Amino acid sequence: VNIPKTRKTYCPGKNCRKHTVHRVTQYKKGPDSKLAQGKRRYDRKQSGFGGQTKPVFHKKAKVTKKVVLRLECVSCKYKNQLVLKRCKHFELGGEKK
Amino acid sequence: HSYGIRARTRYTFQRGFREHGQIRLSTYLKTYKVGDIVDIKVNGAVQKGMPHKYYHGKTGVVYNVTQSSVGVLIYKVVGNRYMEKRVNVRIEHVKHSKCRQDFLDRVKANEAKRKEAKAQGKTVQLRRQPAPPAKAHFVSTENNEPVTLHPVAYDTTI
Amino acid sequence: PDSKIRIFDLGRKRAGVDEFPLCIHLVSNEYEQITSEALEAARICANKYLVKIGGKDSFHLRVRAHPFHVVRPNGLVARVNIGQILMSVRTKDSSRATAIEALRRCQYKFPGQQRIIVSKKWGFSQYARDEYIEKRSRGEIIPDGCYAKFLNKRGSLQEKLDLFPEASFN
Amino acid sequence: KNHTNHNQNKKAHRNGIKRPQKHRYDSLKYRDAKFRRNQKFANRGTVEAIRQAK
RNA sequence: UGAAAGUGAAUGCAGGUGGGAACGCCCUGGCGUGCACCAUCGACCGACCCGGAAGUUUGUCAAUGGAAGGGUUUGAGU
RNA sequence: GUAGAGAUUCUGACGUGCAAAUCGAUCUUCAAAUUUGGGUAUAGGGGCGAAAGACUAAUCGAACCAUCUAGUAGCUGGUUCCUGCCGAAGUUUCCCUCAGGAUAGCAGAAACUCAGAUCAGUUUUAUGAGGUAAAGCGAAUGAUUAGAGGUACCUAUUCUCAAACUUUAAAUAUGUAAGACGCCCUUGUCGCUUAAUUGGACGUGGGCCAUCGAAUGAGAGUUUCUAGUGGGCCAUUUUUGGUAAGCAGAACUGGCGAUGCGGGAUGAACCGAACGUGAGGUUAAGGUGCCGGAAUGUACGCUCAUCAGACACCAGAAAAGGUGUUAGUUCGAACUAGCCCUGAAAAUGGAUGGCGCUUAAGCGUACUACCCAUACCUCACCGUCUGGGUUA
RNA sequence: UCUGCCCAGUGCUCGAAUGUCAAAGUGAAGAAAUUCAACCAAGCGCGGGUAAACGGCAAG
RNA sequence: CGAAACCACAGCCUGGGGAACGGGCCAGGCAAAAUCAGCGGGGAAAGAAGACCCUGUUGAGCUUGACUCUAGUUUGACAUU
RNA sequence: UGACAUUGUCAGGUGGGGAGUUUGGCUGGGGCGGCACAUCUGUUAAAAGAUAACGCAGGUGUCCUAAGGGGGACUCAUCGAGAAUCUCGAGUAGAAUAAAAGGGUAAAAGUCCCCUUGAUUUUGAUUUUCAGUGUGAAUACAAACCAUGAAAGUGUGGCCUAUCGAUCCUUUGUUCCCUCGAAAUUUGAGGACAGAGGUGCCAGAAAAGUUACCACAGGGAUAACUGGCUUCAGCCAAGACGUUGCAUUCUUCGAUGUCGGCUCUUCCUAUCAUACCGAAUUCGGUAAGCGU
RNA sequence: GUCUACGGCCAUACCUAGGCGAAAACACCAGUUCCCGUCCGAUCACUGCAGUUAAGCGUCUGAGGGCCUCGUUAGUACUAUGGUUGGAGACAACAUGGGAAUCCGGGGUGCUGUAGGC
Fold first, then answer.
1. How many Å apart are D5 CA and H7 C1'?
2. Which chain B positions have a beta carbon within 8 Å of D12's beta carbon?
3. Do A71 and A26 contact (CB within 8 A), yes or no?
4. Are strands A79-86 and A66-73 parallel, antiparallel or unpaired?
5. C77: which residues sit within 8 A by CB, 6+ positions away?
């Protein structure tokens, strides 16, 4: 699916409270931090004899992810997030029909 | 089985034969108030605001009025109780119950008879009564002499 | 599946409506089923007997049960009600005995019970003998191949006039 | 037997298909918001005007 | 009441409305009167979304502070 | 070949033995990888094994002892006095759930509230909704027989069909209404709505005011906690898969399960009727030759069977015939029916229940009398519940 | 009396890429916690040997 | 002189119905003490909570490139130095 | 021989030699298959709603910045007529409408053009599956913000009926937010609020075999084994054609000993022989006494 | 009564052939500078009344097609309930009730509301 790189949509930032142009990009999951509480608890739990202490997931059944649009206000820099339907092939600002 | 919203709705949501086309506009020119008793008849052309197939042919009382729809309250048997179902149904799928209008016309007539009975100093029995057995009557035979009939002999028509 | 019986009219199927006045029906007496192979075997028996006795020009035979009901695909059968006509033979008044015996022999090819009934209607038409005579007498019946056209009060006038010149339009 | 609806209607009618209790006043909440707002103000003036008349 | 920081329950006879126990008055009702309980419309307290009046001192332009007022949102509240 | 060490066969004896492995005969070896005493070493996830998972104190695909340990139990078994009162479920949704739980239903208790209300597995009246049966195919669609006409066609016809074709369209089911939370008039609030006190919603103040607005019958309703249940089965009718099935699967209702009694000889669901302890009377279903309570009753016929028939469910037979016979129909001939016979055919001796029954004690119809259930009726008594009294 | 053919695979065995490479240690950034960057044995991986190795009939 | 197994109660058949092969139930055939030696038709005879099969979120033996580990082994680092 | 090497600690790799565990369910027994395990249309289905089978005919894990939204003009599939692809007649949809099927659609919901991003933010209320829990999908509004149109109005994705996801954890957005509890500042972390990442066994364990050496607790809820039920003789005329007849899982898994032969007795007739008849040795009828 | 605008019910209104239509209205019609749109002012947009009732439009006619209503079909098919009814069954009959559809035949061929013009 092709999504235009820019769109005029409502900006819920308090400085805008109106429709404003937003730059559209694709949300990328951030790098996992070693110092998160879950990561720290996992390292504490995994240290020592006992083998594996947590479920490890294999039965990956989904083939595509919900694409997430990161809307970025041109005026007040406010950032919004929209989720769309699942798509196998995704374009951002491709050629119009 | 499949359990969609419009499953097995081929005949009930179908538009009538030679009744297809454009919806008549007296539907939109009608007024509904809360307390009105209305019938639900899902018009298949208008897909927005369609109540579920259970409510087709169901009659209820209006409880809410919006710009384009009507809130109808219907009692649906669920296991061992009637549960209050409040469907937001578009006015195309709605019509006034003629039974209510017949009742209101009868109420107006009853008040009229009561007023005239009071004015005349008489008592008028306002309860309807079921059909009674026929009265005694004479049946005249003049120019209507009885014709004696016998069962016909069996024959092979074809 | 293909039905075993393929021909459904035998004899002079082009015979005029006036030529064969007598009609004899082999009628099912029971609510039952008839197989396609049963229908064609009785058809062969009826055609063989009738052509042997009176010849191919003395009768018109029409089997009216069509094997349209599928049995569960392997074959086709004819679902028959009570009183439904299975076989029909139209002949002259002389061939009454021949047609009756032919249907009597063809009973043995069909399961269940059948009755031979001499229909009081003229030939294969729906009109009884007396009303067919009287309507033909006053002129609303015109033969058309194996059947006859009947004047009806509906339609235009000039077209009915030049198709039916003897008709007396009151 | 995986499924049947044999004894279910009997079980329903033993305590009867009971109807919900009828109340004179139903929630003006859960209705149209604009109507609810104005009816609050209309009710508030009505009770005050009754009080003033009394 | 909220995750917390924190804030923290009377516009009114501690409101209206409907039905209601018991009582009173009148000629069976009517009229008052309404406990208890539900239906419901509000008021108040905390969150949530706005709105920032004072006031405090420290950055007075500000920093901090939160009043009135509005949402028809919410709580295991008054 | 003997002693000795073995243990092939009889698949002999015995097989609660003499014996928890023995005896008899037969057989294998018999001077060496031989047989064997005592001493000594190797101990349990170990030993030892010319290897069979063999052996390791009658215990070995992990010895024995004691403890953890009363290990765990969706699994099997059992679970102890009486009467009275009420009385289920095998269904819903979710679960690594399918022999199990939770959840809803059904049930019991304990309360509270309302009240001529507030309703009903009901009818009527009024008014909706549906696409099944039926019908149709010369109304579209699909399939299909035959000629006629005008030229692969076209036109008027014709025979026959559809579970996912259909214009049409039932019966049975199903929704709602049938007033006092009513109606009529006046009039008030609003930030909503309108061109507008214009409406809409809620009200005030009045008037109408239990034939108060169909029938019939009932007092009605709401909380709280919790049990058991979450294998069902049969029949009526409808219906699917199946060659069929005492087969598998559903729908509606009634039953059995949980239920005795009368009857069908006998039987969980068939027929009748549902049950406190009794007396009398009367019936239901079904019966009245004898077993067996009760007419070897009445009336009119049919039937003769060389292995007749005899009561629903039900414990089974068809086409087609039969100089069997009794009646009919239409022109002696054909048909048409009712009974009988034929078609009809198994294995312990045996089944209308038996005995027997032939102008029946068989079959069809009609009419009386009779017999009898725990059902009905009257009465007595027991208990339960409900209602009304009781400060003498 | 013979014991054939096959090193593809699998297993065993022994030479080179430098592709990988943990903890140490080295360099930079930060106030540090640390975050980056480069290097690293073994095992690999690539390459040679091996069937009286498993196996097959890469060889048929 | 003197056991034991086994034992709901018992013990003549045919048929019916029935959890679809009754000793009992229903309808029949029938039916006279007390016993002895034989016998193997029946008592679906006795002998062991089927040892085949399935079920259980019950095991164990063995196997492998199952999951997860571990003795050992191997290499790097620091220590000893 | 030698600061090598061995040892102690750590970090890589190896490790069925050894340890512990697991090895989904549904299922006309299990197993193999299929996925009926999450879901849509038409049926099954008996004209409300509900309704089953490893019943039936196809589908779903996508696709689309337009194929979403608004406005405007236009009319479609066809068929006839005719000019070296457009021409005009008829044309109730016989076409198209992303994708299965069903329904809807004609100055449109189809086809072209024009402008857009309602495929937005924030509540509550409803509908369907339903326990009236959750998820999913949907409906009517209210408070903003917009698109479009002259306007009425329409628009909270697709004409309607499918196209999907908890706790924990991780990550992202938001606030000039809260906390790190002796007091601070800067990092870092933890919170509230809104999403995403994934559980297809789709209300969501992290899991290979084998057992003929096998073991338990059960099961006739469930197979094998025993039982039961179920699946040649005419009629017809041209001996053909026809037509009518003679798997299930109820019992048993606290066990009913499970082929054949031998032995032995009995019954049956659907008669090989024997007796006695009827036709033209052969075909028949009576016939199970007797033998085989 | 006729005509126009806006409608309601949405074929008794539609389709086809033929014959009429006085007034006004309506329509066809003249033109392309303007607003506007096209390959083409043919459509659409704009300005006007020189002619025509030829068409549209109204109406009458066809035992026209269709459609609508009534009767026939027909108390028929079907169906709720009932029987220890019949029949081996298929199915049928009866009892107390409910009750169609096609063919066919007759009639009909739009009614009406508001504001106006004649």
1. 51
2. 77, 79-80
3. no
4. antiparallel
5. C33, C34, C35, C36, C67, C69, C70, C71
Letter for the amino acid at A87? Answer: C
Whole-number Å distance between alpha carbons of C104 and C26: 8
DSSP string of B96-140? E-HHHHHHHHHHHHHHHHHHHHHHHT-----S--PPPPPPP----
Resolution (A): 2.8
| D29 CB closer than 7 A to any strand E atom | yes
What whole-number distance in Å separates Cα of residue D30 and Cα of residue B84? 14
- Give the residue among B97, B48, B47 at the shortest CA–CA distance from B72: B97
Q: Do B80 and D12 touch (CB under 8 A)?
A: yes
C163: its two tokens: 């198709």
Is B29 in the C-facing interface, judged by CB distances under 8 Å?
A: no
Length of chain A: 97
User: Are residues B66 and D32, on separate chains, in Cβ contact within 8 Å?
Assistant: yes
Classify residue B21 as left (phi > 0), alpha (psi -120 to 50) or beta: left
Alpha-helical (H) ranges within chain B are 98-120
Distance, CA of B64 to chain centre: 22
What count of other Cβ atoms lies within 10 Å of the Cβ of residue D9? 11
Interface test with D, best of B80, B82, B88 (most D CBs within 10 A): B80
Question: Under a CB-based contact definition with an 8 Å cutoff, are residues A26 and A68 in contact?
Answer: yes
Q: Are C119 and C24 in contact (CB under 8 A)?
A: yes
* H or E element at residue C104: helix C96-106
Q: Which has the closest alpha carbon to C66: C19, C108, C7?
A: C7
Are the CB atoms for C141 and C132 separated by under 8 Å?
yes
Question: 3-state class of C123 per DSSP?
Answer: coil
Strand order in the sheet with C69-71: C32-35, C75-80, C69-71
Q: Encoding tokens for residue C32?
A: 């039952």
> With a 7 Å cutoff on the CB, does C69 touch strand F?
yes
Distant-in-sequence, close-in-space partners of C93: CB < 8 Å, separation ≥ 6: C21, C22
If you write DSSP's letter for every residue of chain D in order, what string do you get?
A: -----SSHHHHHHHS--BPPPP-S---STTS-HHHHHHHHHHHHHHHHHHHHH-
β-bridge pairing A2-3 and A91-92: parallel
Angle, helices C36-53 vs C96-106, to 10°: value is 150
